Design a protein around this ligand. Sequence first.
Ligand SMILES: [Mn+2]
Ligand SMILES: [Mn+2]
Lengths: 205, 205
Amino acid sequence: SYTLPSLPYAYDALEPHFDKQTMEIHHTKHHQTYVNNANAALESLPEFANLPVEELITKLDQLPADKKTVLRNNAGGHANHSLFWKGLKKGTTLQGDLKAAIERDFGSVDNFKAEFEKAAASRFGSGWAWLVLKGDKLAVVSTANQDSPLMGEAISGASGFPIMGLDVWEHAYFLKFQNRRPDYIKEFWNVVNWDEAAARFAAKK
Amino acid sequence: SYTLPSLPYAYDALEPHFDKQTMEIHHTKHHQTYVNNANAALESLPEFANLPVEELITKLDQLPADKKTVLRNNAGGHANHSLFWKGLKKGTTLQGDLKAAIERDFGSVDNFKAEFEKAAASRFGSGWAWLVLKGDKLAVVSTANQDSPLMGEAISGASGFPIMGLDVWEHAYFLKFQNRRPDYIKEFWNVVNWDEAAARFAAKK
Ligand SMILES: [Mn+2]
Ligand SMILES: [Mn+2]
């Protein structure tokens, strides 16, 4: 089955940017629930239960009709949160090949940042903002709810391999930021883990 | 211009069921933002800006194409929250004609409550659960984000005249209930304003 992953850090490691109370709730309650609900749906599907979550969400088309929504939502949630935790760290510097590719595809890092903040801010309701690689080009996309670009365009309205992303569900920012999602988005630049983004880019470029 | 309506009650008037800190945030921050953002989008539209919000959300297809989404979202938000506040009150009982109509259409009050609880729990992501008068048979429906059944089926996936509704955006229940939406849904029965519901049912419109 799926399990709630251990984190790369203690819950307080992203202070003073992301609050430690939210980190703990978000991991132990929200993420745990997606794991639990995905596992419940996979119990009757032993041919699907063994797959890594990041692979199963690329294969939702192959599921029985009555399993597609619950696994989209809950396997999407598990995949997305697993990426999110790995994708946060203080003290990194955008550099190297990923920096150059961002400058190439967006014209500058600041142009990219403005585009990413706009996508993150304009996702109305629950969802995620992503930096993806499509082939050879980086792009900013957003998804609804627990959809992922790994699910493809038909399902999610987006596609590409997610280099990094930002959770814009209200549970991710309500305690510290209330409705001020733009303020939360600003703090994300202090904690986006460019080292992990760079490693993912190196594997896929 | 739209304005933030004053509530019919103090922020603690729904205690011990809905918490007064959420009431205050939800009103003064979340609802205010929908007011503000809807007014910004309406300034260039004198022929829509001064209509009641409940009227506006019935003619979204009459807007310029570049205004449809922002006003669906923000006039929806203002309409829905305005209904919600008037749709909460302690010290009401489901009774009279409305009770009889629920029994007629659902078989029993408890069948209605179970169907409402199911719809409210199964709305994945942000949205609302509604009791509507849909060809004046009563029905339970849900909508995404700030959509309303007053917007019609093509836009919202639902239709009918709202009798009452429950906000299931995370901001409505995070502080007290965290991720435990079923517990929040249970508490709603202690605060839904059956007098306002009964008045809306009587009016039908
Ligand atoms: Mn989340
Ligand atoms: Mn709300």
